Design a protein around this ligand. Structure first.
Ligand code: S99
Ligand code: S99
Ligand code: CL
Lengths: 544, 543
């Protein structure tokens, strides 16, 4: 493990030096600007911040250094920042004045390649391998006048809804030190949730924008996978197209997400990556205030919702009905099949071999639980173990069988099944003439190092990665004493280790945020946001 | 083969009865409408036909029955029509008046599912299996007032640029009976090419819109794969996503292609198939008359062009330069790798096993050559044969090696290579600041039953299926006596069987049409059409 230890030493050194550089830059600004009101600046909603930047009422220098100082401070308690993006003080001076995001500091998940910086993903193999250029979405953010300023932490490999790796260590939830911030966009969730950044970018293949957004009490949107460019993003599995990765914004309110999307969906983006359909942001759809037909479910019958989750969903449904929306019971067909056969099979068609390459010679972070050990099992043993478990723990049996390697022939068969499945859910949707769908969202935040042992709980989010529908989350309530107490009566629908771990993990969560999830059809991000805006307005009206 | 023989008998009976129904309907209309000038109606460009339908100057009944009569007539010499779509006389009466295609008769490749009709693909297994509903693009066509009226022939399985199957037989080029119409959208090419339909829809995975459009002297466009809905289309390989199928229009002129795309890219389409990006047709791009930076190559260094092909490309380049456009030498990198490893590998990742299921218990049409025989070979033998051929016939060796079955792990590796390759060609393109690319297009038409034995010749077209860029073809010239005579001097770059067959196949083509290919970046169909429109105006005025 000599190489891996050396890598961790070098990465920790680089982190420490970055945070020093941040501190020195902040103190310099503060010496030259003693009269600035920082707390007022930091509490302005993004849309107001932008208008003040656009009017010259606030300087971009003031905004950037005030947020830099806040980011450095909140990092002390969260360990969310891995790198200060250095050059950002010269982008600050060169930011296009007419840019939609002029002067706005933006945080980036560590996978958004930035010239001269590693995108380690917590893997020793990627340390000391700095990017030669900014990824396309970074380029566009800069062309729109934004100032990307930090890389934020992720769990090792990014394939996890916790947030620890052997290079930079563990990110903590800003609400409670014992809780996971979620992830794999956890650093973003922790930073934005603490007030350290107004806007961030994450990525999502099974809930990685939505988990941190829910657990840290912020808003996030996972668009249709090819709505935004993935060109130049750092990944760790190559050529897996059955369940595609999506990138999208995270922020403190829904309007911020809409602004971000609007800024990104510009000619710069479409010319820098011709493979993205040139679909501009449709403001009129986003701004619509007509009644909606809203499908909803209280449970997916796969992961029993926590008391807080169930209350969150029911209250939101009640408030929407009171506001004049039509609430229609709706459940996508064959969720177990979709999660166990289509999603798991799509992610692990090769039995994990490609994924496991990344860990050769490296430490495996405890936050990944036993995933690496299981993936390393011979296919025949996965199959045999599957057969033994099936009668008692069919969920566990099904995940094991579907993580086996297979032929290109059988992958084709799976890819066709995914396609047909998507069309089957679209058919149900049209049959009930739905506009949008309201679902529960996992939480309250799980304890540290339990997401990796509660894999079944991805059911609420991973379904919409399999279907490739835009899906976002909005905070709507906080866990009450009653909600938390009632977790003692949680049994789960299967009573397997995943249900047992989740019961324990979600305890001790009084005061923690809880969200719902908002879904629309492919390419309907604007309608998704219109619905998220409605939920936010009804459940948390002062976010506006 | 008892089932297969019975299937061929029942399909031939159905075709015969269809053509009879058409004839009877045509004769009825003519009895009631003796004073109609048909020849003038038939020679109206589509856009004028549409305005007359829209103004009430011509009735949709007159238009439909005149074209039906013409379709029936030209089918005598081409065998392009497999089925009359029967209910179309009721769609004719129900066609929405405000529809962009109101009253326009439309021909459909047989794979476009139509309620109550087989989409056999020339395969016995699909005979007697009528569709329960219209595919989404048929639905949209109808909502825009169009009257789909015939299914047109395809080669067995559709994976071929000839056009014969054991059920309905061989489709012939309307220009010369000994020539292939191209394909796999060959019946469309033959029908539109002879004047029997003003507008048709084809599909394309390796050139299947572009070959028949070139060989029959018409215009066609293969859009970006997911620009139009494939929902409800009949296929024969399921779940192969490395090299995506694309569907698109074929017509007599470029403006017809633009109108079809405009009418298709409507709210009805986007609501019926939510998986398609809701990108409306950008008329301002299509109508743009600014100078273009036009990349071009005269050869892809893989398939030596015929004398007519080369002259077609050079004259088009020269006219474009005369018109003020900047012509910039450009060639996509690593074409052999793209064709041999990415395209062939993508199409046959499983070694052909999924494809071969379709032919179990069936006859194999001669127009498929030895493709089914080679796909049936054991993987180890494909490998050994590959090694033996490599020193003399490296093209043939590479295709063989890359038609072997592999693991999902290796397919992932291939899909990543495809993605990176696309990005490499886009980077070349941006480095030269190209707007569009001009390339040769295969032809003149090959002799019947030779496309199946000249697989290397798909190089010009298949490259942009691999890259998934919009690509269209426009006729620009005809083969001269000199062009044809010089085929004697054709050697090919490889001198393998495919070069030898192609030399023989392209002989005896004096008078036959020859096209060029127009390419743009993904999602830039309107720019592609703007460039096709320029080529057509410069090379063929009156069109
Ligand atoms: C997140 O969406 C990952 C959330 C965790 C979902 C785990 C799903 C699962 C676990 C075990 C068995 C079957 C299913 C995310 N991951 C990425 C990512 C990961 C790796 C490479 C690139 N991106 C991005 O966002
Ligand atoms: C046409 O594009 C097919 C053109 C012929 C290309 C052959 C390429 C090749 C042959 C041998 C080895 C390697 C490459 C077309 N085909 C379809 C189709 C076929 C089967 C199912 C569905 N669609 C559509 O268009
Ligand atoms: Cl797409």
């Amino acid at each position: 493990r000599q190489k891996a230890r050396g890598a961790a030493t070098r990465a920790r050194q680089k982190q420490r030096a970055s945070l020093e550089t941040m501190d020195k830059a902040v103190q310099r600004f503060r010496l030259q600007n003693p009269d600035l009101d920082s707390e007022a600046l930091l509490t302005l909603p993004l849309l107001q911040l932008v208008q003040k930047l656009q009017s010259g009422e606030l300087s971009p220098e003031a905004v950037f250094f005030t947020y830099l100082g806040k980011a450095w401070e909140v990092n002390k308690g969260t360990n969310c920042v891995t790198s200060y993006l250095t050059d950002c003080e010269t982008q600050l001076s060169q930011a296009p004045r007419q840019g939609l995001l002029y002067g706005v500091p933006v945080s980036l998940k560590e996978c958004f390649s930035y010239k001269g910086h590693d995108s380690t993903l917590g893997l020793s193999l990627n340390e000391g391998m700095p990017s030669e250029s900014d990824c396309v979405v970074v380029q566009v953010l800069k062309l729109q006048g934004a100032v990307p300023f930090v890389h934020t932490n992720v769990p090792q490999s990014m394939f996890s809804y916790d947030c620890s790796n052997p290079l930079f260590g563990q990110t903590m939830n800003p609400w409670k030190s014992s809780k996971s911030p979620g992830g794999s966009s956890g650093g973003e969730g922790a930073l934005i949730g603490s007030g350290g950044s107004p806007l961030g970018l994450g990525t999502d293949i099974g809930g990685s924008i939505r988990f941190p957004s829910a657990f840290c009490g912020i808003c996030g949107l996972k668009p249709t996978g090819n709505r935004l460019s993935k060109s130049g993003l750092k990944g760790c599995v190559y050529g897996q197209t059955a369940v595609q990765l999506s990138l999208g914004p995270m922020a403190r309110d829904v309007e911020s997400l809409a602004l971000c999307l609007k800024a990104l969906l510009c000619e710069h983006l479409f010319t820098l990556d011709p493979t993205v359909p040139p679909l501009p942001f449709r403001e009129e759809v986003y701004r619509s205030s007509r009644p909606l037909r809203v499908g909803y479910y209280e449970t997916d019958n796969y992961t029993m919702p926590s008391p807080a989750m169930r209350r969150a969903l029911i209250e939101t449904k009640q408030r929407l009905e009171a506001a004049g929306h039509t609430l229609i019971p709706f459940l996508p067909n064959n969720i177990p099949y979709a999660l166990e056969v289509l999603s798991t099979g799509g992610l692990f068609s090769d039995g994990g071999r490609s994924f496991l390459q990344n860990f050769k010679g490296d430490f495996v972070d405890p936050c990944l639980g036993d995933l690496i050990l299981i993936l390393r099992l011979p296919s025949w043993f996965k199959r045999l173990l599957s057969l033994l478990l099936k009668p008692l723990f069919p969920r566990l049996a099904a995940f094991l069988n579907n993580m086996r390697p297979r032929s290109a022939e059988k992958l084709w068969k799976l890819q066709h099944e995914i396609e047909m499945y998507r069309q089957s859910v679209i058919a149900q949707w049209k049959a009930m003439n739905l506009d949008v769908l309201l679902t529960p969202m996992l939480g309250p935040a799980l304890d540290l190092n339990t997401p990796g042992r509660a894999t079944g709980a991805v059911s609420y989010t991973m379904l919409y990665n399999c279907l490739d529908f835009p899906a976002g989350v909005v905070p709507v309530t906080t866990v009450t004493a009653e909600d938390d107490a009632q977790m003692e009566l949680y049994k789960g629908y299967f009573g397997d280790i995943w249900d047992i771990i989740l019961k324990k993990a979600m305890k001790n969560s009084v005061g923690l945020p809880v969200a719902v999830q908002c879904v629309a059809l492919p390419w309907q991000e604007e309608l998704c946001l219109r619905f998220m805006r409605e939920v936010e307005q009804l459940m948390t009206p002062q976010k506006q």
